[PDB]
Amino acid sequence: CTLKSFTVEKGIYQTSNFRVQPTESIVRFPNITNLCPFDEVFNATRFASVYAWNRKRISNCVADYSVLYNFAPFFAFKCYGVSPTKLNDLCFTNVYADSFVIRGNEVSQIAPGQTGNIADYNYKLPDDFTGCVIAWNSNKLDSKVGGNYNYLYRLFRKSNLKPFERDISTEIYQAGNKPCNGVAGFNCYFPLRSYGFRPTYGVGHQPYRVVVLSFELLHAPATVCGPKKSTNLVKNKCVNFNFNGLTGTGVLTESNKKFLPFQQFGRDIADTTDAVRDPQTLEILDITPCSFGGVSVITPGTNTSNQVAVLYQGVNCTEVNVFQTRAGCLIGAEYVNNSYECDIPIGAGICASYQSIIAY
């Protein structure tokens, strides 16, 4: 096939390249610590009113959505602009967590393009909102038999709210032509009304805690990225290695090289990686690429015989009628202590001939 002929003349022909196939993938990514404080926002003992909705900016930490999935009570986990499945891999620059309490019937109003009291006067999302909305029942934390009068909402406002805007004003709503002058009465109502939560309310009226996660990308480098799983470490085998974003394929043997504490990788004279420090355990490993060889076929003429021998150039015999030569591993030829003239050259003083195929 290599010579593009059906008859092969006597000699040695370099026909293929032997390779040691990678067996496992070892992805020793950096030690995952200091994850984002989602416990502080989602599992807070006290939430905020929807008019004064609490906003927490999230940056420079490991975004982690495992905890959210673990939690069973969630009524809605509806996501917009990104899929919920690919939250952990696609990553963003800043994450805004907005926390408030509303009634169950209004949870449908927390979406782009919706109208209502909450959307127009309390919390508005833009039509191109990229993020997720999370809501859950909070009867055990926000309902009182006497009535929980500590949760408020805005019922009256002159104009609709812009997206991601808050209004904490307590100005008396002037619905008519006469000035209110700060005193309530007819055509002058206080805009903030209390969510009098009680445990015996219907499911549409029980208190629901809502956290809106808004993801944004800017010109700054994105520093809130989800954890990359670090599998166990396997040594002494040809494994595809991914160490702190540096990728390759090679054996990882023990190293005698003492790195300084600030150094992470190691390079050769010819600027090829020869060492690395594991980011989980502070140890030095000698990255050595897997064995490769030039497969050469030693054959006499097809007129004479069809027997062949294979020389793996540069490959030790333990990594592939097997004989070890300085040229490489020769399989299919029998070493003979007799000396003859060279017929088929193998290398390093070794020659092959046909009498079976012998090497001498």
């Binding site: 520093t223 300084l260 600030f262 190691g266 390079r267």
Partner: protein, 256 residues
Amino acid sequence: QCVNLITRTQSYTNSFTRGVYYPDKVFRSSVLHSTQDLFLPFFSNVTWFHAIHVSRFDNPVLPFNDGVYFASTEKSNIIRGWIFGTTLDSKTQSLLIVNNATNVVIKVCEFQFCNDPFLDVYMESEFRVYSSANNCTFEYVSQPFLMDKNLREFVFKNIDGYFKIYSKHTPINLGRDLPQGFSALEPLVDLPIGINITRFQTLLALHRSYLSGWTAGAAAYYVGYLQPRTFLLKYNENGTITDAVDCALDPLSETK
């Protein structure tokens, strides 16, 4: 509470071979590696600043250029950090680095910095450093890099969103403050800041008197400016930079 208290004089000295740092986090052993980076040139003109407070504004804001080499032979408590930014007011973002006895706080906010900023000890207050700090987007607290005769060298770079700080502490036998020989600066922190930095200023600490509200003090420090330069660094058997040549200093080093 912005008050003008520090006067500053300046002289010119020779850098010798100070200011070399590790350009990456790659171990190289027994090799000669040529790298092009922002380096302090050999035998370059370095400004020696003496800042004196005795018990008008004479402490101007220095340019940052492409990065700053800072050196001091003083103790760790007198010089307490730096200020980085462009306008140093509430209209642009700014970086504040403040060291104390236990840790270092590096913090990027919209600081309205004072004309003559200094940390005053009484506990430590930053009200003489800035008057306000709003829209704050970064904070990083870690172990300090001014710890305890000892020459302290720092390299500040602001490259493609990252503020890189390199440092080294070298015990210098009594003599010339900028000594001969080599002492390479190890990589200390890479901060994902992403702000525009064109100007910088050094922060000093002043003590209250309790008896001319602040005690009289003096601080001497060397400032040099990094330039895009090609260096040839020698890595020994253990990976340490023990020698370097500046490729553009003289024809002999250029041949090297």
